[PDB]
Design an enzyme around this catalytic site. Structure first.
Site, PDB file in Angstrom:
ATOM      1  N   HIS A 175       0.761  -1.210   0.400  1.00  0.00           N
ATOM      2  CA  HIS A 175      -0.036  -0.162   0.079  1.00  0.00           C
ATOM      3  C   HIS A 175       1.245   1.270   0.228  1.00  0.00           C
ATOM      4  O   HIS A 175       0.082   2.335   0.034  1.00  0.00           O
ATOM      5  CB  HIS A 175      -1.237   0.611   1.012  1.00  0.00           C
ATOM      6  N   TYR A 232      18.088  -6.850  -7.474  1.00  0.00           N
ATOM      7  CA  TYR A 232      18.024  -8.786  -7.837  1.00  0.00           C
ATOM      8  C   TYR A 232      19.044  -8.760  -8.505  1.00  0.00           C
ATOM      9  O   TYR A 232      19.564  -9.915  -8.681  1.00  0.00           O
ATOM     10  CB  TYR A 232      16.740  -8.579  -9.644  1.00  0.00           C
ATOM     11  N   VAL A 267      10.321 -13.092  -0.371  1.00  0.00           N
ATOM     12  CA  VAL A 267       9.400 -12.413  -0.237  1.00  0.00           C
ATOM     13  C   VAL A 267       9.695 -11.741  -2.443  1.00  0.00           C
ATOM     14  O   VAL A 267       8.789 -11.364  -2.252  1.00  0.00           O
ATOM     15  CB  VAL A 267      10.339 -10.848   0.397  1.00  0.00           C
ATOM     16  N   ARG A 268      10.978 -11.551  -2.909  1.00  0.00           N
ATOM     17  CA  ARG A 268      10.756 -11.059  -3.837  1.00  0.00           C
ATOM     18  C   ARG A 268       9.683 -12.455  -4.751  1.00  0.00           C
ATOM     19  O   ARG A 268       9.381 -12.268  -5.581  1.00  0.00           O
ATOM     20  CB  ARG A 268      12.794 -10.850  -3.925  1.00  0.00           C
ATOM     21  N   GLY A 305       6.219 -13.586  -4.625  1.00  0.00           N
ATOM     22  CA  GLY A 305       5.166 -12.384  -5.170  1.00  0.00           C
ATOM     23  C   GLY A 305       5.408 -12.187  -6.454  1.00  0.00           C
ATOM     24  O   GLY A 305       4.429 -11.847  -6.547  1.00  0.00           O
ATOM     25  N   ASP A 306       6.900 -12.086  -7.453  1.00  0.00           N
ATOM     26  CA  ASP A 306       6.950 -12.184  -8.616  1.00  0.00           C
ATOM     27  C   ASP A 306       5.659 -13.400  -9.081  1.00  0.00           C
ATOM     28  O   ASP A 306       5.096 -13.088 -10.075  1.00  0.00           O
ATOM     29  CB  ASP A 306       8.372 -11.900  -9.204  1.00  0.00           C
ATOM     30  N   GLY A 358       2.601 -11.145  -9.915  1.00  0.00           N
ATOM     31  CA  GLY A 358       2.976 -11.085 -11.271  1.00  0.00           C
ATOM     32  C   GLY A 358       2.095 -10.444 -12.095  1.00  0.00           C
ATOM     33  O   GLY A 358       2.569  -9.286 -12.883  1.00  0.00           O
TER      34      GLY A 358
END
Ligand SMILES: C=CC1=C(C)/C(=C/c2[nH]c(/C=C3N=C(/C=C4\NC(=O)C(C)=C4C=C)C(C)=C\3CCC(=O)O)c(CCC(=O)O)c2C)NC1=O
Length: 212
Positions: free
Chosen positions: A22, A50, A128-129, A132-133, A137
């Protein structure tokens, strides 16, 4: 806790996740208030982190920890660079871009994890990356196309070339998490790191929202 690591991660990181999701920058971006320029700035900062995250993944995989989880098909840095070539119209961005203060902290942590070869910490950041992607994504890619007319060839980051069945892949990712051999110390370390990972990401968005 009782229902396995994947469940504990989701619950433990809930508050940091919500804060990150948010942020004003991400909120404005997804609602169509910004533009391809702002999306490009985000992907430039994402290329920096990344790149660092994937050096840490490579170090941890080579140590023999969480090997099946750390699927090299997930690597985003090279695809990202190709996206940025298209978004910026040349390779000019490589010598232009600079890490925001948020990205400096985030990269520094990833480099510490790399050189420590800290498996549990790396898994937290990977979750987390990448998860999530894989999960949200397609929503981001759809909004970039819808609001801003971004060419899908410049959204390679979100495509995950090499994964056919995405739902099965996410399910198997969570099962690999549950299957990791972790001491109480290691599990606690992983959980805290996952919250910090969301905290870094939120600050990245905050700095993007500013002139940074
Ligand atoms: C710092 C921002 C941010 C990060 C790093 C993030 C990561 C993230 N998003 C997730 C799911 C998800 N994330 C989204 C949605 C989004 N995801 C987005 O990044 C954006 C902008 C949306 C749009 C609301 C959705 C729809 C899921 C689906 C759910 C799920 O599989 O649990 C998960 C999976 C959780 C789990 O199943 O344990 C992670 C780790 N979400 C975030 O918002």
């Amino acid at each position: 806790a009782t229902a396995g690591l994947a469940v504990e991660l989701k619950q433990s990181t809930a508050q940091a996740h919500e804060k990150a999701e948010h942020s004003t920058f991400m909120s404005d971006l997804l609602k169509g208030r910004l533009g391809v320029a702002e999306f490009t700035r985000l992907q430039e900062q994402a290329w920096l982190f990344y790149t660092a995250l994937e050096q840490a993944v490579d170090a941890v995989r080579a140590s023999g920890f969480a090997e099946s989880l750390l699927d090299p098909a997930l690597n985003r840095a090279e695809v990202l660079a190709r996206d940025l070539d298209k978004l910026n119209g040349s390779s000019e961005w490589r010598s232009r871009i600079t890490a925001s203060p948020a990205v400096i902290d985030y990269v520094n942590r990833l480099e510490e994890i790399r050189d420590n070869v800290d498996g549990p910490a790396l898994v937290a950041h990977h979750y987390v990356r990448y998860l999530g992607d894989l999960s949200g994504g397609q929503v981001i890619a759809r909004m970039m196309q819808r609001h801003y007319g971004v060419d899908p060839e410049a959204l390679g980051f979100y495509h995950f070339e090499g994964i056919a069945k995405l739902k099965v892949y996410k399910d198997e990712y969570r099962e690999k998490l549950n299957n990791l051999e972790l001491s109480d110390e290691q599990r606690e370390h992983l959980l805290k790191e996952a919250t910090d990972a969301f905290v870094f990401n939120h600050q990245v968005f905050a700095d993007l929202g500013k002139g940074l």
